[PDB]
Structure formats: structure tokens, C-alpha cells
Design a protein around this ligand. Structure first.
Ligand SMILES: [Mg+2]
Ligand SMILES: [Mg+2]
Lengths: 288, 288, 288, 288
């Protein structure tokens, strides 16, 4: 069971990426048991990052670790290919992309052709990122059987959906991307890519270790606390809340998200910290 | 009753915008009776265009006409503001943006703050572009009541939703963005922003003229044909099919869309042309 | 253009149908221009009515008028067939049914077989009632082309959907069932089946007469008022509000709906009447 | 961990319930390790059953066991209350209902008042049946906090939604109603109400026993097979297919479903049996 972190991209107040904070953050996550870093994913504001910002994120993280999966998706296949060619010359775990997005009603063959082009040029293992609620498309096994897929990150609240890949794609590693299903993924799939690893990494690593010891009740209790947090964060914007919580739980500044993913105001951040306080104590009591 | 065209962005085989073809195309549309041009819209591949590409489209079109609505949306508010400051220097119809997109579950206040920032800096009338099927969000009238909105392009199959803006926002011009509801829009709203104006402009202009003469049956008859076209185009990818039809119907080359919006292959194009031929005859018979 | 009323079913406080009020209500609607009555439809609580209640509704109304379309749907085809055989012996306009409901994931052939059985035994014209938001199924033309369909009531906010039937089913009468699209239906389809005819029949008949005279602006203004009413009624329960409004606008008691379609409390009914007052005056000013 | 069966209602060729087959079937299920029976559920054709039919199913089953959850829902609260008063006289596990259905856009208070009325008159523990895909409504925990709820059957593919009830309603027993999530439910909730218990009860009982022994891999392996079955059944109509499989797997005839839930033709049945045969072998090999 692997615990992969879709790392956040720290920005300063002017909306410029702070690579020092990114490296400090990554080192800490890795020291605490995180198995790999998914760069430029949804939590990392991937689609909001320019071609060069995606590249600079990889370069910065490449000075810290080799355990990197590079997400390269954009709405111009020329730019995507430029990022694949760039990453070919580096020693990373894999290259990834979510499907074409924004435009509705694109024929399925477009999705297929998109991935075939990435597969044709990449010299790295291919990780399909399936996120229907975000892109508007569900990549079906029909298209995946044709491609050299190594792993799939499936963001879907229906575990049966993630499990269907495991069955139809022999040998492919499947990871579910929801924080609210970690316990179930750790008992049925190859791991998880969970946004919450950004601020409670020790908690998620503890879940896997408890499950490895056969202590499921304990792992389920941690999951219940996680699901309560997730429920509180919705009203503030889950990604935006994460920045405040990393500082709260981990003790270092990771800056702010970049608008339209607006940062929490001072009041919102103070309000958030009050709501989560009881969950904090209870989590630190079970994980120390 | 205004007939607005979301003009396509001509690209060459390498994916570079061809601004000469953009000008030739826009000029023909105006001569055929199109009243204004929505620049960098969905049909124009807006979200897939870089900041610079969006700017050059506006510069190019400005030479042809000033009846331009400048769509500037992106997932980095700083780039949006940069385009707004740039357009403040020019004499145009207005500035527009669709809502933030991709990221699901963003709080409503985020959408409000995004539009507030455009308004704060813009010296042009604001045109709100609502396309829930694409962005994942519906901009309710409640958010628009505080902004200096002059126009709303509403791409929604429910005409009552478009009429709702009319009712709740006095003095605001509302245009529906669906090709399949043109007839109804010309009988209730302030106009239409229909992608089919790119290849059958004279048909849509003829519908308005027939309606103004009281010949609704004839206009409705033209709508039936338009809706049959829409069904055929879906299979090929509507935007991609438009590039092929512009050449067919108008006589000049507007190039290709840019992948992930894949161009039709020569086989596909020839297949499309045969399939729409009977409809093309019925069209060119009712619209001399 | 026909104006069909999906008549409400009056109940007393004990949940028993009051046929005298039903007849009084029907006479008034017919005197005011309503062209036909759709019995046991959604507004008439069809699926909540027992086999015998559906039969008694038809018998009672049959003492008032011959212009009746009899909706007979239930989750036991034996009961549906018993109602079709019963109605065969009476002189009415047609027999109707919405699709199988409740159970999700039923194969399309089930819908087909359901209607084929009704078509096999009925000696009356068949009216398909398509209401996807209620049944969970959209009956596609594929199945309708095989059946002897005379008319279709399409409840869908997408007029292009209702218009698609007109085009694919030559000779079939198509009526849209939304109060918020009446104006558009009266300008493109064969009529409407609108719940609001229960309390503002003169208003809807006036819309058609105005459109018949070419006075579209006037007909659109009436539509704007209708859409404002619809928006106010949602919070109370549209069907439940109708009972109170029939009494308000028409001057006779039609009783109450039957739980789970709960009646408005005294306070709710008083609150409703206050909200609609301005719309009343403005409607009675334009229709007297 | 409770394994509950939503028992099918056996009908003869004419559509009359066969209570002898209902008893034979229930007895076999108990002997194979099923713990309780959910009577008149979706799989039991609840909504399609008349008030009297729902009552006779309970009377019949009562002779076999008292571990009965009596589903009483209908679109006439008076009939619901009549069934509740009747069941108050009997010694059963509890009384249940799914929410009001068909009618869309009912206010939330209507759903609350419906359940309040059942609670006011019932002398048995209340089991809330949540099936949004069928009824069109999701019963939130907020409505349940005031009622004396003892159990919740949640048919939802999102396990976090089922876990949410656990977290927000202390002391309430929660069971997930999906065949494709059985494994996960047996590792986190209080049990399952799975329709496949009708034909592969020993498989589901074996999953629980394997889990209790710590053999998760074996239980997960059985889930894969179950999920492959679910895919095959969809095409034929899941409920209808179950009647054919009960005879196949268990050796006695449980008749036919009742139209609109059409029985499989002899050709369809023979086609189903061939398609599931390979899976049946893998099943009967891991479950001696
Ligand atoms: Mg370096
Ligand atoms: Mg009589």
C-alpha cells in the first residue's frame, strides 16, 4: 500500500511560486513516510499553472527527491508534449495527465488520441489521472487497454469504479484519490493519492501501518476523524484550507493559493482553526 | 435583436494562430449580417489559448470592427487582470469571462470575488458568460446584482433560465448561446451568440428577418434544419466540424482546430460533407 | 394551439376524493377556454391514486365533458390494462401513461413492452407522457416509431427536446408540459399541458389569443408574470400551492392535496397569498 | 455484522403472489446463514405491491421468522399508517419506508413530516430506507436527528455517505444496500442489505466469515466475482435476472417478477445462464 501526496504549490501574496517553501514542505512529507509525490495535480493547482510553472515545480522537487509523478495536462497538446520531452531527460517515477477538460461533448476518440500522443513520446511509465467531476469525462478501460498504462489515479467516491480497473487492467496499479475513502483503498487497491497528506501525513501513514498490523478498528477511527475534517473544510474551499492547516499542523509557512482559488481571509482562517480544534486534540492523542 | 458570432480561431497545421484568416473570416461574417463578434469564446478555443494568443486575436479583429466582446477568462486572475488592463486602452463593445472552471466544489463567494476583481479594474461594460455544462457552475442573478453587468451570454438549454436574468436584472442585455434555440431567443431575448453563425450566417440572419416580417413558420422551418445539423455535428466534434463547414459553405480556408480539439481527418471530413448534403440543399433552397 | 389542463384531484381533510368539487372545477376551466382535460396526471396526483380513484375521477369528469385524456400509469401492468379496458367503453379523446417509474436501471425493452401492451388493447388514441425528471427514463423516438402514437406530452425544460419529436414523428401532436415555457410552446408546438391552467386559465387562454392576433410582446409579458409566480411557488410545493390559489383566483373550494403531498398550513397559505398579491393585481390588470 | 436479505416476492404467471414459494425461499436463506429479511423492499417490488400484498408478505414470513423489517412505503400516507397500525400488533424487528417518490421538487419539510407521522404511530423501531437513485431524494442526517431511528439502509455507491450517518447519529445501525460494496460494508458498517443474498447467500456469508478469520484477500476475491456478476445482470434487468438465478443456484422455483418488471424470456434466461457459467464455477470452487 502506497501513500502518495498530491503536493500543494506554495505562492506568495503576488501569486508567484515559492520553490523554497515547496522543497521544505516536500522534505517534511517524505521524512514522515509519504511514498511518492504527485506534482502539478489538482491540489497543486495543475490546470492553473503555466507550462513553465509546471516545469519549475518538477525542477525544484527534483533537488529533493526522485519519487516524483509529473502531471502535465493542459488544453494545448503541443505544450503537453514539450513537458513530456523535458521530463524524458530526468529520473522520475512517471508522467501523468488528466483528460481533456472544459469543452463538453468531445468525442471519445479525442481522449484516446490525446493519451496515444503522450504514450508515443514518453520514455516514462504512464499514470492515467481519471477525475470525472473535474474534467467531465470518465476514461473507460476500452481506451486504457490500448495504452501502456502503469498506474491509474481514480478520483471517484464509488470504490466499485476504482476496483473495476484492477479487474479489467491486469498488472496496472490503481490508487483512489479521495480522503474520505483512504481506509477502504488501503484494504483493496494499491494505495491512495490523498490531498490531506499535505497536513496530516503521519495520520495517513499510521492508518496503513495499523492495517499492516491487522488493527482495523484503530485505522477506521482515524478515518472517521478524517471524514469530519473533510466536512468542515468544504465551506472554506478544501484546497485553500489546506494551506492554513499545513502551517497549523506542520509548523512552517506554505504561503497561499492563487485566485480564483482564493486564500482564506484572516477571519476565515481563525474560524477554521476554531472548528478543527477538537479534531486536532483527538488526532494528536491517537497519533504521536 | 443582435446576432453575435463566437468566431473560431484559425490555426495552421502546427497549432499557430493564423490572424489573416481570422480577419478574412470576420469580414465575411459582418458582410453577411453578423452584428458583433465574441472573441476567445468556447468556439474560439478561449480556455486553450494562451494569454498572448487572446490578446493578438483582439488586435487582429480590431482592424476589422470595434463591435468586439473580449473574453479573457483563465485560471490565474493575474493573467485575467493583465488582459483587462490591456483592453481598457481600446475601443470595444465589452469585456467578458466565463466562471472559474475545472476545480469542483469551490465556494460561491470565490465566483463572486473573481467577477468583482474584473469589474474593479475594467473600464468597459462587463458581459457575464454563463456555461455550466463547461465550467461546472451556474452564476445566479444574486451574484450579478452588485456588479455593473451590461450583458449576459447564457449557454443553457432551458430558456426560462435565460428569461430569469431578464426578469431579475433590469436593463441587462441577455443572449442565449445555443444553436438549437435561436428561433425562441429571437422571439424573447436581446439576441443570440450561436456558433453556427461561423458557417451559416445568412441562415440565422434570414431567421431574424423572417420573424420581423411576421413569417414565423418560415423561421421555425429553418430552425428544424439547424437542429438536424446539430445532431450530425455531435458525432464529429462540433467545433472541429465547424472548421470544415466554413470552407464548404463560405469558400475560404480557416485552417484547423488545435489538439486536444482534434481536426477531422480527410476521411471524416468527406463523411461529414456527404451526411449534411441533403440538409445543405434544403437550406440553400429556403435561403437564396 | 391547444391548452390542456392537468386537472387537480380535490380531497377532503381525510384524504378522500371530492368528485363534486372536481366537477365544479372542470366546468369552470372549460367555460374559460381550456381545450381538454388530462385526468390523473402529475398535478392530479396520478401515481398517488389507487386504481379505483383513477377510475372514479374519469367517471365524475365524464358527467361534465367528453374532452378527456385518461392517464392510467401504475407499477402493475395488470391494473393498467384493467383501466384501459374500462375506458375502451367510453367516448373520450385518448388514453395516456407515463413510463415505468421508481425502479432504476430497467432495460429499455421494458419501457417498449409496457407501451406495446397498452397499444395492443386500447381502442383509443395513445398519448405518451414523457416526464424524465419524475420517472427516471426518457422515452426515445426509437420506441415511439413502432407504436401508434397520436400525441406526446413532453415535460422537459429543453424545448429542442420537444421539437425533436415533431421532426422525427410525422403527424404526432406534441405538447410541452412546463408553465415556464408556454409562450414558446404556443409558437412552435401543438399546444401545452400546463398545471397553472388550474388557477389562471383565462391568462393562458389570453396568451394564445394574443399570439393568434400577432401580439407577441403582450403574450411575453404575461409569460414573465407566470415565471415569477412559478418561482414563488417552489418553496411551498407547486402542487400544494395550486389548491390554495384555485380558491384565491377562481372563488370556489377545491380542498387539499393528500400527504405525502402535504397541504399548506394556514400560515403558509397566508404567506403565499401575500407574496403573490402584486403579481395578482398586475395579471388582473392585463387580463379582465 | 448482520447479513440482511431484501427477499424477492414470488409471483405466478398471472401476477398473483405465491406465498408458499415465499416461505420455502425465506427458510432456505435462513438455513444458509442470512440473519434478517427486509420485506417489501425494492428487490421485493415494494412500491409495485398493493397495500394488501405488502401485508400478506409479512404474515407469510412471520411463520418462518420474526427477524423481519417491514417496508411500508406508498404515495398515500393513510395506507402507510394503516400498515403501521397493523404491524404494531406483531412481533417484528422493525418498520421501514423509503422516502416519497415520483413527484420531483417536493420541499424537504414534506419528507420530514412523512417520517414524523410514521414515528408518531409506530410502536416498532424505525428503519430509514435511503435510495436517492430511486426516489429522487437523499434523506440527510439533519432530518433523522429528531426521529427515533434505530436503523438506516443506505443504497448509495459512496461509502463515505453511509459512514456519515454512523458519525452523525450515535447508536444507529447503518447498512449499505449495494451488492458491489459488500466487502467494504463488512469492514466498516453494521451489515449489508444486498439483493444477491437471494441467490448466492452462502457466498456473502462466506465473505463475512473469511473477514472474521482475517482472510481479507479471499473475501476481496469473492467481491471481484460478485462485481463481475453485477455487470452481466444489468443487461437483463437485475431484479428479473434474480428470479432465474434463484432457481439455478438454490434448486426451487420462485416464479416470475410482475410487469413492468418483465420476466426474462426463455431465450434470455438461457443466454444469462451461459454468460454467468464461468463465474459460477469460480464461485463454487471458492465456496464449497
Ligand atoms: Mg537541480
Ligand atoms: Mg355518468
Amino acid at each position: 500500500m502506497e501513500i502518495i501526496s498530491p503536493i500543494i504549490t506554495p505562492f506568495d501574496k503576488q501569486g508567484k511560486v515559492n520553490v523554497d517553501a515547496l522543497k521544505t514542505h516536500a522534505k517534511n512529507l517524505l521524512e514522515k513516510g509519504i511514498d511518492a509525490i504527485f506534482v502539478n495535480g489538482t491540489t497543486g493547482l495543475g490546470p492553473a499553472l503555466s507550462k513553465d510553472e509546471k516545469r519549475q515545480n518538477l525542477n525544484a522537487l527534483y533537488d529533493v527527491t526522485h519519487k516524483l509523478i509529473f502531471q502535465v495536462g493542459s488544453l494545448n497538446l503541443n505544450d503537453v508534449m514539450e513537458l513530456v520531452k523535458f521530463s524524458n531527460e530526468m529520473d522520475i517515477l512517471g508522467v501523468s495527465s488528466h483528460s481533456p477538460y472544459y469543452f463538453p461533448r468531445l468525442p471519445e476518440k479525442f481522449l484516446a488520441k490525446y493519451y496515444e500522443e503522450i504514450a508515443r513520446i514518453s520514455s516514462h511509465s504512464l499514470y492515467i489521472y481519471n477525475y470525472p467531476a473535474a474534467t467531465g469525462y470518465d476514461i473507460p478501460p476500452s481506451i486504457l487497454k490500448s495504452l501502456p498504462v502503469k498506474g491509474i489515479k481514480d478520483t471517484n467516491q464509488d470504490l466499485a469504479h476504482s476496483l473495476e480497473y484492477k479487474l479489467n487492467l491486469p498488472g496496472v496499479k490503481v490508487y483512489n484519490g479521495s480522503n474520505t475513502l483512504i481506509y477502504y483503498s488501503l484494504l483493496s487497491l494499491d494505495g491512495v493519492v490523498a490531498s490531506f497528506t499535505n497536513f496530516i501525513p503521519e495520520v495517513i501513514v499510521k492508518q496503513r501501518d495499523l492495517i499492516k498490523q491487522g488493527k482495523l478498528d484503530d485505522a477506521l477511527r482515524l478515518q472517521e476523524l478524517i471524514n469530519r475534517l473533510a466536512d468542515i473544510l468544504r465551506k472554506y474551499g478544501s484546497i485553500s484550507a489546506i494551506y492554513v492547516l499545513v502551517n497549523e499542523f506542520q509548523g512552517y509557512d506554505v504561503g497561499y493559493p492563487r485566485p480564483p482559488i482564493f486564500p482564506l481571509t484572516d477571519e476565515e482562517a481563525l474560524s477554521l482553526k476554531r472548528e478543527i480544534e477538537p479534531l486536532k486534540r483527538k488526532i494528536q492523542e491517537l497519533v504521536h
